């Protein structure tokens, strides 16, 4: 067993993008699904590195979103639920799901401000509009279109961590099935922490796991 | 320094409630704010223990919600932002904010199912209702009241982890100001993990911190 030693020379968001694109076009031009997915996942981490480098001198939202799309494509390659699925396929899938979960959670986190005060005004008006459509009794609803767009966007950015939570839990569950591989990987890297691991932690974790997979 | 040894005999949700209520009525009848808050926080953990015991033979939602209310009351006692605020006040506040954060996150988590498919239907209709209020051009909005109630509830349960995230981050920030006390507490208990620590982990963590505070 060997641990990657990691270069601290942080580059420009541009450098990681041609890295990612090259790994990805390397993936695009190969036969064996497994092979493809590995390179796709390597491409993915370079894409993540690029987004991280955007966040250093401030927007990474599009880059991250499209990266989660490339992760779903990749997972649909050697589907871990297939009955022939190998341990390698399942470990690959786990790494994919960690990247996808924490990516979703970052996509959210970029719009946390929006989400919070949107929640305030929305809670207020989703009571005003309702109290005003019901004639009192002594003894469809119509909303301002601003309120409507604010509802649309609130659901938009809250969806991202609904996905993050659910996918995080799939990663944990499927990880129990490769308890040893991921026990050792958590040993040498430290385990990923939902809400605490930054993008560089994820990048290195994923790189190390990809390294062991390519070594078999 | 001494670590509490913890009793594994899990009791009924009823047993913890009269424990909590007794600690709380002990708090209610004392002068010194600090004193009060300590007992309030002890009351709180018994209240949490009670809610946990509800979850064992399946609803803890009300109990948890009202407990977070007792936590905000308690924090409004020796406000850590006061200029006379002691290290003890600040540590107490940190413990309060962990309980409040993870309580919010559980309140959410109880309704995760609701939230997810609500997100689906809401995203669809928040496009149907909008595409149908805008006359096309070749070259306020009205919604079903079911959709309206679903929007209200979706915002309701997503608010809970918006709070959980924000309060979690306040706890981290204020924790940097008592880095050593909480470094040692994480040492002997293991640190609380957002999204991973279960209620019993929180109970024991908080109990241990309360123990050191009462020892000064």
Stretch 61-90 of chain B: residues touching chain A, C-beta under 8 Å? none
Angle A136-A150-A108 (CA atoms, 0-180°, nearest 5)? 130
Burial B153-175 (b: 16+ CB within 10 A, else e): bbbbbbbbbbbbbebbebbbebb
Residue in this structure with the two tokens 């209310």, named with its chain if needed: B69
Does B122 contact chain A (CB < 8 Å)? yes
Residues 6+ apart with CB under 8 A from A122: A147, A150, A151, A154, B151, B155
Going along chain A, which residue ranges are E strands?
141-143
Which backbone phi and psi does B6 adopt, to 5 degrees? -110, 135
For helices A61-75 and A33-56, angle between their N-to-C axes, nearest 10 degrees: 170
CB contact under 8 Å between A161 and B156, yes or no, is no
Angle A200-A201-A204 (CA atoms, 0-180°, nearest 5)? 85
From residue B31, alpha-carbon distances to A99, B36, B77, B214 in Å are 52, 7, 11, 16
Chain B contact probe: residue of A104, A121, A141 with most B CBs at under 10 A = A141
Start-end of H helices in A132-144: none
* B158 chain-A contacts, CB cut-off 8 A: 115, 119, 154, 158
Partners of B142 in the β-ladder = A142
Question: Residue A214 half-sphere exposure, CB side, CA atoms within 13 Å?
Answer: 16
CB atoms within 10 A of CB A179: 9
Does A134 contact chain B (CB < 8 Å)? no
Which backbone phi and psi does B142 adopt, to 5 degrees? -125, 130
Q: Which among B130, B148, B193 has the least Cβ separation from residue A141?
A: B148
Angle A197-A202-A207 (CA atoms, 0-180°, nearest 5)? 155
Pairwise CA distance, residues B41 & B8, whole Å: 21
3-state SS assignment for residue A48: helix
From residue A98, alpha-carbon distances to A105, A149, B153 in Å are 11, 31, 29
Q: Which among B142, B152, B195 has the least Cβ separation from residue A168?
A: B195
3-state SS assignment for residue A142: strand
Domain ranges of chain A: 1-135+140-216
CB contact under 8 Å between A165 and B141, yes or no, is no
* A166 chain-B contacts, CB cut-off 8 A: 112, 116
* A98 chain-B contacts, CB cut-off 8 A: none
Please tell me the distance in Å from B10's CA to the nearest CA on chain A.
26
> What is residue A178's DSSP assignment?
T
Q: Which among A152, A154, A166 has the least Cβ separation from residue B155?
A: A154
Burial environment of residue A50 by CB neighbours within 10 A (0 to 12, 13 to 18, 19 or more): buried
A-B contacts at Cβ under 8 angstroms = 100
Closest by CA to B195, choosing from B138, B88, B112, is B112
Start-end of H helices in A29-135: 33-56, 61-75, 87-109, 112-131
């Amino acid at each position: 067993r060997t641990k990657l030693v990691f270069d601290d020379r942080n580059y420009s968001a541009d450098h990681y993008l041609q890295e990612a694109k090259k790994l990805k076009h390397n993936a695009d031009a190969l036969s064996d699904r497994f092979e493809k997915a590995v390179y796709y996942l390597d491409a993915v981490v370079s894409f993540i590195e690029c987004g991280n480098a955007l966040e250093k001198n401030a927007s990474p939202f599009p880059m991250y979103s499209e990266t989660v799309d490339l992760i779903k494509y990749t997972m649909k390659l050697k589907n871990y639920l297939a009955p022939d699925a190998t341990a390698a396929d399942k470990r690959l899938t786990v790494l994919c799901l960690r990247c996808e979960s924490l990516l979703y959670l970052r996509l959210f986190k970029l719009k946390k401000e929006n989400a919070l005060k949107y929640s305030k005004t929305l809670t207020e008006h989703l009571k005003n509009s309702y109290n005003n459509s019901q004639a009192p009794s002594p003894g469809s609803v119509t909303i301002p279109q601003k309120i409507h767009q604010m509802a649309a966007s609130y659901v938009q950015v809250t969806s991202n961590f609904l996905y993050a939570t659910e996918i995080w839990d799939q990663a944990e569950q499927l990880s129990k099935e490769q308890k040893e591989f991921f026990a050792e990987l958590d040993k040498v890297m430290g385990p990923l922490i939902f809400n605490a691991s930054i993008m560089t932690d994820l990048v290195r974790y994923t790189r190390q796991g990809l390294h062991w997979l390519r070594q078999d």
